[PDB]
């Protein structure tokens, strides 16, 4: 029980570190699917 | 270095030797129960605090 209390304290510290990492948004590009469609159109046009 | 010495504690005035002392289980039982209670309260408070988070 003491060992698991120490482990859960470490997990809480890891959760706080995870929240600090989550503070950095690292948002995916808003137009990834749009860029994929644009390159698909470009490759189709290039092959045509 | 002294055959007999006055009791350091108050409420009594007498001189005793080393052989007069005998084992007292009451004091050790009190110490053991105090240690168990402090350990259990610390474990419970830590567990409750972690459960809150």
Curated annotation (Swiss-Prot), chain A:
The chain holds residues 366 to 413 of 1093 of the full protein. It is found in: Nucleus; Chromosome. This is Structural maintenance of chromosomes protein 5. Present with 892 molecules/cell in log phase SD medium. Component of the Smc5-Smc6 complex which consists of KRE29, MMS21, NSE1, NSE3, NSE4, NSE5, SMC5 and SMC6. It comes from the Eukaryota. The flexible hinge domain, which separates the large intramolecular coiled coil regions, allows the heterotypic interaction with the corresponding domain of smc6, forming a V-shaped heterodimer. Belongs to the SMC family. SMC5 subfamily.
From Swiss-Prot, chain B:
Signal peptide: none annotated. It comes from the Eukaryota. It is found in: Nucleus; Cytoplasm. Zn(2+) binds at residues 7, 12. Acts as an E3 ligase mediating SUMO/Smt3 attachment to SMC5 and YKU70. Acts in a DNA repair pathway for removal of UV-induced DNA damage that is distinct from classical nucleotide excision repair and in repair of ionizing radiation damage. Functions in homologous recombination repair of DNA double strand breaks and in recovery of stalled replication forks. Component of the Smc5-Smc6 complex which consists of KRE29, NSE1, NSE2/MMS21, NSE3, NSE4, NSE5, SMC5 and SMC6. Belongs to the NSE2 family. Present with 2800 molecules/cell in log phase SD medium. This is E3 SUMO-protein ligase MMS21. It comes from Saccharomyces cerevisiae (strain ATCC 204508 / S288c).
């Amino acid at each position: 029980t003491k060992k698991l209390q120490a482990t859960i304290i470490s997990t809480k510290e890891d959760f706080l570190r995870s929240q600090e990492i989550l503070a950095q948004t690292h948002l995916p590009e808003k137009s990834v699917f749009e860029d994929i469609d644009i390159k698909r159109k470009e490759i189709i046009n290039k092959e045509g | 270095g002294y055959t007999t010495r006055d009791c350091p504690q108050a409420a009594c005035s007498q001189v005793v030797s080393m052989r007069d002392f005998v084992r007292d289980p009451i004091m050790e039982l009190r110490c053991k129960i105090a240690k168990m209670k402090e350990s259990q309260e610390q474990d419970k408070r830590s567990s409750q605090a972690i459960d809150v988070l």
